[PDB]
Design a protein around this motif. Structure first.
Motif, PDB file in Angstrom:
ATOM      1  N   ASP A 201      -6.509  -0.837  -7.197  1.00 53.98           N
ATOM      2  CA  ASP A 201      -6.974  -1.194  -5.875  1.00 53.98           C
ATOM      3  C   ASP A 201      -6.324  -1.581  -4.742  1.00 53.98           C
ATOM      4  N   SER A 202      -6.022  -0.636  -3.956  1.00 51.04           N
ATOM      5  CA  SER A 202      -5.167  -0.890  -2.697  1.00 51.04           C
ATOM      6  C   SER A 202      -5.663  -1.900  -2.152  1.00 51.04           C
ATOM      7  N   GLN A 203      -6.755  -2.664  -2.585  1.00 54.06           N
ATOM      8  CA  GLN A 203      -7.671  -3.518  -1.591  1.00 54.06           C
ATOM      9  C   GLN A 203      -7.929  -5.099  -2.097  1.00 54.06           C
ATOM     10  N   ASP A 204      -7.664  -5.204  -3.782  1.00 52.19           N
ATOM     11  CA  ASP A 204      -7.942  -6.383  -4.172  1.00 52.19           C
ATOM     12  C   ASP A 204      -6.782  -7.215  -3.819  1.00 52.19           C
TER      13      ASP A 204
ATOM     14  N   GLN B  91       0.812  -1.243  -0.158  1.00 49.57           N
ATOM     15  CA  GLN B  91      -0.207   0.082   0.105  1.00 49.57           C
ATOM     16  C   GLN B  91       0.849   1.281  -0.124  1.00 49.57           C
TER      17      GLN B  91
ATOM     18  N   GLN C 266      -1.624  -0.141  -5.089  1.00 49.31           N
ATOM     19  CA  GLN C 266      -1.092  -1.421  -4.564  1.00 49.31           C
ATOM     20  C   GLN C 266       0.372  -1.262  -5.426  1.00 49.31           C
TER      21      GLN C 266
ATOM     22  N   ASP D 260     -12.304   1.268   3.878  1.00 50.75           N
ATOM     23  CA  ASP D 260     -12.165   1.018   2.578  1.00 50.75           C
ATOM     24  C   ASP D 260     -10.796   1.501   1.963  1.00 50.75           C
ATOM     25  N   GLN D 261     -10.048   0.944   2.565  1.00 50.98           N
ATOM     26  CA  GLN D 261      -8.483   1.476   2.143  1.00 50.98           C
ATOM     27  C   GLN D 261      -8.386   1.576   0.583  1.00 50.98           C
ATOM     28  N   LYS D 262      -9.264   1.459  -0.211  1.00 53.37           N
ATOM     29  CA  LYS D 262      -9.349   1.682  -1.721  1.00 53.37           C
ATOM     30  C   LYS D 262      -9.578   3.068  -2.288  1.00 53.37           C
TER      31      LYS D 262
END
Ligand SMILES: [Ca+2]
Ligand SMILES: [Ca+2]
Ligand SMILES: [Ca+2]
Ligand SMILES: [Ca+2]
Ligand SMILES: [Ca+2]
Ligand SMILES: [Ca+2]
Lengths: 321, 321, 93, 286, 93
Positions: free
Chosen positions: A117-120, A67, A172, A164-166
């Motif tokens: 997407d910081s989250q995928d 991140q 990423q 929601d870090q995204k």
């Protein structure tokens, strides 16, 4: 000069070894006289790519760490504490640099990518890594680059917390190695930086708070996140993501005297260890990691509530007299 | 316009009240492109001068705090964490500003001074305060200034620790009130800033470590210093110098269950309190000060070793589940 | 082999008396400027104690304020060239 | 408000040895060139006590001689830049110093001292690295005598620049002995050390001149006033209450080392005094 | 009555450790530049032993090679202005 043999102009040389030479990156701040708010461009190092015959990603480490937000105390070792008097971040340039310690005869793959997407979740295999928009594919011994797609959106740091870090993180960052022959070191990657600091605030604390549910999984967070603290029905897990000298404070629910183990790069500093057997307990300790895998774990029984705090610290005491 | 009465040109008006209006001080960094090292000028507030019929100095607080070095976490609430990626400090301008909340009918004295010895001790009385080179003497209601004599010597921050606080610190800062009628508030003082940051380093931790000898006085320090932790033969003392949300970690030697008292501006947040009676104990707690005097004390018996750590923290947990 | 000095020394706290008073209504030309005057000069106390002649270049009286805009009185600073003439009897002198 | 001083202060009377003596054949870098040194500078003491930064321009050691062209010995003044290094061991060591002088005793001698213009601090708050604040160390060394009598009296040629002024320091000395103990507070300067031994006090001079002594102590047991060395007693007054504690005021006047005094008493269970240089001034009833 | 010196002194043999190490993984700011440092300076050992102040004009670190083009590692020279700050924990510091 150079005479290299068996070469007629237009021919190829694959040498015994290659190396670039890296120097003192001394930051420049720029004054964007704005809302009287600041801009920083410096060069922060990021990790030593070790090999993975098999198929590994940032250390086989999981929970998109990596991140791109600054702070990522996990990622950015200097920017740590400036975007710390500030609340909005925005980049202009970020470039992955890949130099190489190893030699033209190691046998493997490294690979840098970029997920918006910081989250995928993370790369599964060969065919997946390669499908990313912003990726690079290098043998390991040879020298590599990657530049990152930066918007100029007004994005927030993690000072208050945000699931929601995204919607807050820029991207990423991946680094992936397959096809090795041994999980030794071949690469050390760097970070080309340029960030626009905005609405500067009372300076946020960098202190970590990490609750395990009684029987459960997970209570609160504040982070950053250097640590994950899991339990298993008996016994804790303190799983490092961060490197350096820390300071650990806390204790937990057990009943059962503490046996202090840990695993990997680790330099224990001060372990103090109150218990009350029957009840719960406390641990302060001071340790110092320089690896992944660093692990530590406390060994105990009936781990019915987990609480800790972690907030980077020196060779500092943490024990009675 | 203004018509003021009983006045012939050349005459004096002592009004019912006066006030200046203070705004958003949004810092400017300047790029002194040097060793690629930075410069900062912003305005940090400093304390609310309350009155002292009697004769008091920075709160009747003692152990030259006040100290002009940046960090002084005790003094400078923002510069806290920049001169934190750096190792040499040097000012160019520092000016004391004294505005006033009170009114033209309070009855007292305030006074700002400057000692070049970060270490000499504090003002005893009237005749002593006044003999200082760089002093100012104001009723309280009326509006005041002080500018500070800055050298350009290459002076060190407190990242490693250093007993001759004088050879490293720029100056001492005083604020002194006598002759009041009540220890209420009349003044709020500010800090005119301008600092030259130099050889920028891996960023130092701000975490506090504070050892009491077994029977003794005092073991180590790391500081900064927000806290002093004394014992008295039974019972501890945690004497605040700092304001905000902290996080407290530690325990001690006793035998005897913990009773958590404290005194003054204080908002307790999380008190956790392992003991083992017979032996020693641990305390984590999370509190939040906005005053002096803030006190806390733990109540216990046979305080035969004192250890703690303190490192500013949010509304963050510090207790089991 | 001579010294020169420029510093600022506090002197006494002016209180009030609706009457008419002079140095505390103490009497015997106390305030004399000579240095020492230990009564007047609390600091130079100990320089002019290693010396035998003196000579001023500047002397300024400075009067700040403890009271408030509703105190109700008169203060007044003067200077007699005769270290010895007596004190002010009344307003008019 | 920056004062400049250039004066000539007296310093000590050098006695001989056969053996090999320094600054008294005493120890712990006594003489340190900082002003104050209450120990070295008897005059500059309470001038720079209203100031915080010191800086010299000239300092010269002067060596005149009271003895006669037939004593048999060595005097020797030197200069160590490290206010902290330890002292001269022997012949071969003294001589290796940069700024030294080597004179018979009877013959007349000089030494001038290497002054920087660094902004150096005086000792009001305390500072264990006495070197980073002190200008130099000063030595005086005598070997090869025949008797530890007097041949020389040395002086101090001064030139000092005083800077930021606030509060005279304490020209006045406060010195507490613990009840059974060692040591309570200090304020100093330090002219005196006041020790006890289980019976009896010690007032051990470091300073020379006319002083004034005030205090008393815990005993029970009438005071017998002894002292030793260069000493000119001036006024001894001596209240006691036997059973309890007591008081002493006295006024004395030292011009030597060793000056000693001691009070003789019993059950010295608390020591307190104050000392603050004073004239031929009274200190007794009528 | 002062000296000046310009010579070249050897310092220690850099060995390898895949780990992450600092001066031999000895600890307590050994390498300090002061001369003496007998640990660091094997030659000046005995000049700055007849002296009390020091001041450098040039200092350069020189790194030659014992190993061969197939050794497999990283070396790294740095400089902290605080003779006292602790050592490097990891790569990123
Ligand atoms: Ca925020
Ligand atoms: Ca430092
Ligand atoms: Ca002072
Ligand atoms: Ca007259
Ligand atoms: Ca001082
Ligand atoms: Ca450093």
């Amino acid at each position: 000069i150079i005479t290299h043999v068996g070469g007629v102009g237009g021919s190829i040389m694959a040498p015994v070894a290659v190396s670039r030479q890296l120097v003192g990156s001394k930051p420049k701040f720029t004054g964007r006289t704005s809302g009287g708010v600041t801009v920083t461009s410096h060069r922060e190092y990021l990790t030593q790519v070790n090999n993975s015959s098999g198929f590994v990603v940032n250390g086989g480490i999981v929970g998109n760490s990596l991140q791109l937000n600054p702070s990522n105390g996990t990622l950015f070792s200097w920017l740590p504490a400036l975007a710390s008097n500030f609340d909005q971040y925005s980049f202009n340039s970020v470039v992955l640099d890949y130099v190489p310690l190893c030699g033209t005869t190691e046998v493997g793959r490294v690979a840098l990518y970029f997920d918006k997407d910081s989250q995928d979740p993370e790369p599964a295999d060969r065919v997946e890594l390669a499908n990313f928009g912003v990726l690079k594919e290098t043998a390991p011994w040879a020298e590599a680059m990657l530049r990152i797609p930066t918007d100029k959106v007004k994005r927030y740091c993690n000072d208050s917390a945000t699931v929601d870090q995204k919607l807050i993180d820029l991207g990423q960052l991946g680094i992936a190695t397959y096809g090795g022959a041994g999980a030794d070191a071949v690469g050390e990657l760097f970070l080309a930086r340029s960030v626009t600091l905005y609405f500067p605030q009372p300076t946020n604390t960098l202190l970590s708070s990490k609750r395990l549910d009684l029987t459960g999984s997970l209570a609160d967070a504040t982070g950053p996140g250097y640590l994950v603290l899991t339990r298993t029905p008996t016994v804790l897990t303190h799983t490092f993501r961060a490197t350096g000298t820390f300071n650990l404070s806390g204790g937990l629910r057990c009943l059962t005297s503490l046996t202090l183990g840990a695993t990997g790069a680790v330099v224990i500093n001060d372990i103090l260890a109150i218990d009350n057997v029957g009840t719960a307990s406390d641990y302060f300790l001071n340790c110092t990691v320089s690896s992944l895998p660093a692990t530590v774990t406390f060994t105990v029984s009936g781990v019915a509530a987990g609480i800790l705090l972690v907030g980077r610290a020196r060779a500092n005491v943490v024990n009675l007299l």
